Amino acid sequence: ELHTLRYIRTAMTDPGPGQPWFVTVGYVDGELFVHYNSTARRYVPRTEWIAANTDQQYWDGQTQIGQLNEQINRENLGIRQRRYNQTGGSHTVQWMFGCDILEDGTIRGYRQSAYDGRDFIALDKDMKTFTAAVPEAVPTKRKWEEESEPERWKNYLEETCVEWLRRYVEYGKAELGRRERPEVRVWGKEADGILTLSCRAHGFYPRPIVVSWLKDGAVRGQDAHSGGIVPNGDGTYHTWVTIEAQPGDGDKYQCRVEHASLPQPGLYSWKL
Amino acid sequence: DLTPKVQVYSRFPASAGTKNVLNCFAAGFHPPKISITLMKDGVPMEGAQYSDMSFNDDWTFQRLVHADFTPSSGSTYACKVEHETLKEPQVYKWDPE
Amino acid sequence: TMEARFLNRNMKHPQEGQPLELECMPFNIDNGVSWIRQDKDGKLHFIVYISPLSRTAFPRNERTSSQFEGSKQGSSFRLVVKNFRAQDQGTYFCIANINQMLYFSSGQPAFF
Amino acid sequence: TMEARFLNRNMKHPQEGQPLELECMPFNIDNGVSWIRQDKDGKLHFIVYISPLSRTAFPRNERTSSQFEGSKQGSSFRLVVKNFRAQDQGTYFCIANINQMLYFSSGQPAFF
Amino acid sequence: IDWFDGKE
């Protein structure tokens, strides 16, 4: 029963043509459920259950929060640029925070920020001070430590975040707890006197999965080239693992798939 | 590196004549400005949806484009990616089966 | 990067006769981790592999699953010692195998 | 099972500015091996993975030999250090990963 | 629910 509530913000100076410079998105158990950007200027549901369990007051307050964050992030982007003596170009501020209810019933919380891809400031694990990864973040820390910001975010992460995460897990229990089996497909192609075998798993949920290439009944280790778990458009996931062998030698290899939706691991073979 | 790492795949195992979704996923890049275009025979596919932009714990950005289509044998499907780290757009071809 | 600490951040050294929990937060969790133990000779001992689905694989001289146990908690892999013994002293490392790449966490010394 | 020592067995110390040849005979050869180097602090550094087809995987994903060279010969994998420098000193280990299981050779000290 | 950031 691992549950997570996460919010991430991105504030850019060079977003791209026709792209919002400020974007905030929220995830419950890895599933995107709320979204705000500087173009629509409104918090919007991204799942049916969050819209079906909230009133207009919720979205109005969230939209107010989002617009206030837009203004604050504009100013913070400018400040971070000037502490580096920077006048223009591609500069970005990133925020990532939230809370986790882990399987032992314990609580975890985090709130970290980044400037131009690298760490800038973060609330430390005791949630009592702010740690500045760069000197340019030391002024902010000072200000944030005289405004009682560490305790504010501690109270948010340890309470508000956790209770609203409990509400979200209630609202989306059927969706978050669902199981969708992967469609697996083994394929083979030969080139330069080498046989590349590939095993693709499509449309599985939840995200954790293991796809291994067995040779002669033994799990291969660093010989398999995996692509990681990548997203589908519909909230499911996809993965693919390849392995190189000799021209022929095809019956030696098997694909094994271990997932929460399969009571026993699936085994698949090539059929040319 | 902060160049885009791209992957092109289909929602379901592709079969000629059956509807499916073509996904192009770019991950691990920075700055977040990026161009990702799905192409049926060098022409941009119709109905392409660009997902919301997120980043991992290492602050590297990700983006997923997807488009509904019916895979046709005798048609090449690719993904064109432009980014600051690349000195020329990069094309990633899709292996149907 | 990766570190491997005691679960309790107050604990400096492990105690005899009591359980001991080692925490390991890897930068990538989509793949499992392996726990290894280095002795005073410097030789390396494989302890257990913990998979992303929390399914553990122990050496074939099967009896560690009697002694130590691997688990996953949130985004962190955990190795538990029922009873810390004299032969359990050593430097414990976390190993992550991402593609053909090995990544080692900073070792945790369990001595005295 | 598996050891991984100098090809040159009369040679006691690795020398500065010259190549250095390490051989590693694993009990299983149909799977590749990894060369890793431990410092004097005990930090562990991944050097290279050599596949059964002799296809090398270097840190940061590279396939390019900038400093090191990995290859397969008979029933022994071979790691050469093109230019042995002061920062290349350390204890070198061979790692075999068979069936989610790690097996380590005893480390070899390469020090001036 | 989201919450407003602090001023830097």
Residue numbers in the entry:
A (entry chain A): 1 to 272
B (entry chain B): 1 to 97
C (entry chain H), D (entry chain G): 8 to 119
E (entry chain C): 1 to 8
Task: Give me lines lifted from the publication on this model.
Critical molecules involved in immune defense can be subject to an evolving molecular arms race with all kinds of pathogens, of which the most famous has led to the multiple loci, high allelic polymorphism and high sequence diversity of major histocompatibility complex (MHC) genes. These genes encode the classical class I and class II (aka MHC-I/II) molecules that bind antigenic peptides and present them for recognition by the T cell receptor (TCR) on T lymphocytes bearing coreceptors CD8 and CD4, respectively. TCR and CD8 cooperatively bind to the peptide-MHC-I complex (aka CD8-pMHC-I), which amplifies the peptide discrimination. The CD8 dimer exists as a glycoprotein on the T cell surface in two isoforms, CD8αα and CD8αβ. Of further interest is the fact that only the classical class I gene BF2 is expressed at a high level in chickens, and chickens can live or die based on whether pathogen peptides are bound and presented by the dominantly expressed class I molecule, intensifying the selection for appropriate CD8 binding.
The current study determined the structures of chicken CD8/pMHC-I complexes for the first time, namely, cCD8αα/pBF2*1501 and cCD8αα/pBF2*0401, which each contain complex A and complex B in an asymmetrical unit. cCD8αα binds to pBF2*1501 and pBF2*0401 in an allele-dependent but peptide-independent manner, as demonstrated by the CD8αα-pMHC-I interaction in previous studies. Remarkably, cCD8αα binds to pBF2*1501 and pBF2*0401 in complex A of cCD8αα/pBF2*1501 and cCD8αα/pBF2*0401 in a novel “face-to-face” mode, which is distinct from the antibody-like binding mode of the known human and mouse CD8/pMHC-I complexes. Therefore, “face-to-face” binding causes the cCD8αα binding orientation to pBF2*1501 and pBF2*0401 to skew towards the α2 domain and β2m, which might facilitate larger numbers of γδ TCR to bind diverse peptides presented by limited BF2 alleles in chicken. Moreover, the “face-to-face” binding mode leads to the loss of most hydrogen bonds and salt bridges between the CD loop of BF2*1501 and BF2*0401 and cCD8αα. However, more water molecules contribute to the interaction between the CD loop of BF2*1501 and BF2*0401 and cCD8αα in complex A. Importantly, the MHC-I α3 CD loop (residues 220-228) has been proven to be key for the CD8αα-pMHC-I interaction. So, these distinct interactions between the CD loop and cCD8αα might result in the different affinity of CD8-pMHC-I interaction in two binding model. However, cCD8αα/pBF2*1501 complex B and cCD8αα/pBF2*0401 complex B present a parallel binding model of cCD8αα interaction with hCD8αα/pHLA-A*0201 and mCD8αα/pH-2Kb. Complex B shares the same antibody-like binding mode with the known CD8/pMHC-I complexes in mammals, of which the protruding CD loop was clamped by the CDR loops of cCD8α.
